[PDB]
């Protein structure tokens, strides 16, 4: 419905423009909420006062003649705009012209009345906490406008998102206390505007409080807008904050409603807003797919809505970025459109898009249920290197997931042989399990697959792990040994299973029996059959129909031992009894294949919210304890430095 809303808003805006032109000719069908701000900025920077204030230092000829005249012997004071510097390397580490110390908040306190709070927040050293900042501003009694209030709240929000997950509540309480102070401070004149409310919504989104953010601050902003006509107009920033909150809280219906409201209010959306809309549609599609797997907007309808969002992206002439490509790929993966995923990748690579590693994650995940793409996967992996990117464990896991789904095996073997071994990274249990599943379910497996599986298992055991996939990993390894005929390897993996302490499984014993059956050449005989068949009685493990089939195959492969015949009779009787008790014979269920999206693949990285600019600019006031007189002292230089000094040895 978003495309219909867009065209309806465009035609209504055109009709209103024509009506007002007649009352009072091409005009945009929408309204830009940032054009007036950029125009004001351009006028400000082109104003003569700004150009005169921010001017280059006077040359020696401009200052005067030669030197020695006080006042005209050095260039006068030079002021620089940090956001748009007219010089390079604003700061310097000379001896007599150090200006880094002159950039802390104490020096700007003097001109706090004319101060731009956003500029102060972005460019200052040893700033106090935002609460103390607001307290100092109120103590100085300056008329804080909406921009200043929003800048203070944005500084608080930066602190919130910098802090850890389990340390957000105190910062959010500080933010709400600051909001209350701003509301109740009548003097000096302090206004809480749409931008400030949007920043509070952003704080609520960063903390993770949908109930505290959507029903409180957005509601307050809407009430202010309806109470005061045109004095509290909602910009694109407020709705961007609303969409951020919806994405953070998982709300999809509210996000769609907010985007539809933006479209209807006859103002153009933002690229970030459209990316958030695509993310919400992807979440809805994933939920629908989960519901269908368990087995309510129609899947075709949600696919059409995603397509019309992508169309609106160019309808409003909004440039697409890497985040846009990632969101569209995620939405298409949720809607199962690998052709559109590939088309989007081609379009991104066409004009100018720096494809991130997540884009290739989605590319590999999109074709998981499609055959005849192993060469495409290999070419993607090869092309990763020229793009400045390197494959990681997540991408290798996705590739091996594709290999296991397509049960090709040769592709997984080639990938491991020519991409992974060069990485020298620790494999993950999911990666190893997927590799072994592909190498076992493939057709015509080879001994090199067994060697690679053993190498991967050894490396996984040598490295650490937190998850526990040991039982399925060894079960698939035993199935591979069954398909290959490696009875010795299958029997030796039992020692590893015992060392891990995991109990044996009827599926594992069936794999051992199948290995004995199809290892006529290498080794195996009636003695091996008896030794394997003595497990069900001794280990009290229930037999199975696959067990009966495997033991009959082993019987036909080697001969007729009386113990084997008695076991066959008793297992036939037990299977008949189980069929009488139930309706269908039991069977060894296959191990499920992981098909989870890459965004929930157990990322092995929490968060690093570090800033190289702050580290180099020594924000927060780092200290190094420099050396003292040791470097400065050089001794007496009356004579030359000779060995053993001037007076070698002395007696007191």
């Amino acid at each position: 419905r978003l495309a219909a809303a867009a065209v309806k808003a465009a035609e209504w805006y055109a009709a209103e423009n024509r009506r007002k032109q007649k009352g009072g000719c091409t005009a945009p069908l929408w309204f830009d909420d940032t054009e007036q701000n950029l125009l004001a900025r351009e006028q400000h920077v082109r104003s003569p006062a700004y150009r005169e204030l921010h001017r280059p230092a006077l040359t020696n000829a401009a200052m005067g003649l030669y030197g020695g005249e006080p006042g005209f012997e050095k260039a006068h004071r030079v002021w620089v705009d940090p956001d748009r510097p007219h010089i390079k390397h604003i700061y310097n580490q000379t001896a007599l012209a150090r200006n880094l110390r002159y950039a802390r908040y104490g020096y700007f306190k003097r001109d706090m009345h004319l101060l731009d709070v956003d500029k102060l927040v972005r460019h200052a050293r040893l700033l106090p906490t935002p609460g103390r900042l607001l307290t100092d501003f109120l103590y100085q009694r300056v008329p804080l406008p909406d921009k200043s209030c929003a800048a203070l709240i944005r500084y608080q929000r930066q602190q919130i998102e910098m802090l850890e997950v389990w340390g957000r509540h105190a910062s959010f309480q500080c933010a709400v206390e600051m909001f209350e102070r701003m509301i109740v401070t009548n003097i000096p004149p302090v206004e809480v505007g749409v931008e400030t409310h949007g920043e509070m919504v952003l704080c609520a989104a960063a903390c993770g409080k949908w109930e505290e953010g959507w029903n409180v601050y957005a509601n307050r902003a809407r009430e202010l807008e309806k109470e005061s006509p045109e004095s509290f107009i909602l910009n694109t920033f407020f709705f961007d904050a609303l969409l951020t909150l919806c994405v953070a809280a998982g709300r999809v219906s509210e996000g769609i409603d907010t985007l539809e409201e933006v479209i209807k209010r006859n103002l153009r959306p933002r690229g970030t807003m459209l990316n958030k809309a695509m993310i919400l549609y992807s979440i809805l599609g994933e939920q629908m797919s989960k519901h269908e797997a368990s087995r309510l907007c129609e899947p075709e309808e949600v696919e059409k809505m995603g397509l019309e969002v992508w169309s609106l992206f160019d309808f409003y002439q909004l440039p697409r970025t890497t985040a846009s490509i990632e969101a569209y790929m995620r939405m298409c993966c949720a809607f199962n459109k690998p052709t559109l995923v590939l088309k989007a990748q081609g379009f991104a690579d066409a004009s100018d898009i720096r494809l991130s590693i997540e884009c290739f994650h989605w590319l590999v995940y999109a074709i998981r249920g499609v055959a005849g793409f192993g060469d495409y996967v290999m070419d993607v992996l090869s092309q990763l290197r020229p793009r400045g990117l390197t494959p990681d464990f997540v991408l290798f896991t996705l590739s091996f997931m594709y290999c296991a789904l397509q049960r090709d095996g040769e592709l997984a073997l080639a990938i491991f042989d020519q991409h992974f071994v060069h990485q020298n990274m620790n494999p993950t249990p999911e990666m190893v399990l997927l590799f072994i599943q592909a190498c076992s379910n493939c057709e015509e497996p080879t001994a090199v697959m067994l060697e690679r599986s053993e190498t991967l298992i050894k490396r996984l055991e040598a490295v650490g792990s937190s998850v526990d996939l040991i039982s399925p990993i060894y079960d698939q390894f035993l199935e591979l040994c069954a398909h290959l005929g490696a009875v010795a390897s299958g029997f030796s993996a039992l020692k590893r299973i015992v060392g891990f302490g995991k109990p044996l499984t009827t599926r594992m014993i069936n794999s051992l029996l199948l290995a004995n059956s199809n290892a006529i050449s290498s080794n195996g005989s009636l003695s091996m059959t008896e030794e394997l068949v003595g497990f069900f009685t001794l280990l009290k493990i229930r037999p199975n129909a696959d067990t009966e089939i495997c033991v009959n195959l082993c019987r036909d492969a080697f001969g007729e031992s009386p113990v084997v015949n008695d076991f066959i009779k008793v297992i036939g009787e037990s299977l008949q009894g189980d069929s009488e008790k139930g309706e269908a014979p039991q069977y060894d269920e296959d191990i499920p294949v992981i098909q989870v999206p890459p965004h929930e693949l157990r990322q092995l990285r929490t968060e690093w919210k570090l800033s190289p600019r702050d580290i180099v600019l020594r924000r927060f006031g780092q200290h190094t304890k420099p050396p003292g007189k040791a470097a400065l002292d050089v001794g007496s230089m009356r004579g030359s430095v000779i060995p053993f000094g001037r007076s070698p040895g002395e007696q007191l």
């Binding site: 389990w166 340390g167 957000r168 509540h169 105190a170």
Partner: protein
């Protein structure tokens, strides 16, 4: 025990005290916490007291012990609620339970020579012994005292 809390409250009516305790318990459960034990020590005679809600300097209060297993983020909220409750005259929080007090001050050898699991698994009563209890009682626990405590009034 993760956290202990001793609440000194004004001896209001039974319904009001029950409502306050119910609110505390509901807050603890809603913040993803667990209550090991909640006990009422009755109304005692403190040496000095001064109410905050009623501003009456009178010596009459009730003591309550509350054992909790909650994370720091939610324990902050619970502590704020307890301290801001009008009925709670004075709340003291014992967080020095999983680690013995002043091992660092005691000795460097004892700084890393303690096992937190024993203190964590034991209740607050075993961590801080009451005057009436004794290791004699503790040893009587495993001595089959039922079959022996039969002639305790033979004289």
């Amino acid at each position: 025990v993760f956290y202990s809390f001793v609440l000194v409250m004004k001896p209001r009516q039974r319904r009001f005290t029950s409502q306050a305790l119910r609110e505390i318990g509901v807050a603890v459960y809603s913040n993803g916490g667990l209550i090991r034990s909640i006990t009422n020590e009755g109304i005692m005679r403190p040496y000095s007291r001064f109410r905050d809600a009623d501003n009456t300097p009178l010596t009459y209060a009730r003591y309550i012990i509350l054992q909790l297993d909650m994370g720091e983020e939610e324990m902050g909220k619970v502590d704020k609620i307890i301290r801001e409750h009008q009925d709670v005259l004075m709340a003291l929080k014992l967080n020095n339970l999983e680690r013995p007090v002043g091992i660092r001050s005691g000795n460097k050898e004892l700084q890393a020579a303690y096992f937190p699991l024993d203190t964590f698994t034991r209740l607050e009563e075993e961590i801080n012994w009451s005057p009436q209890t004794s290791a004699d009682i503790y040893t009587q626990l495993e001595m089959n005292w039922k079959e022996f405590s039969r002639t305790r009034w033979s004289s």
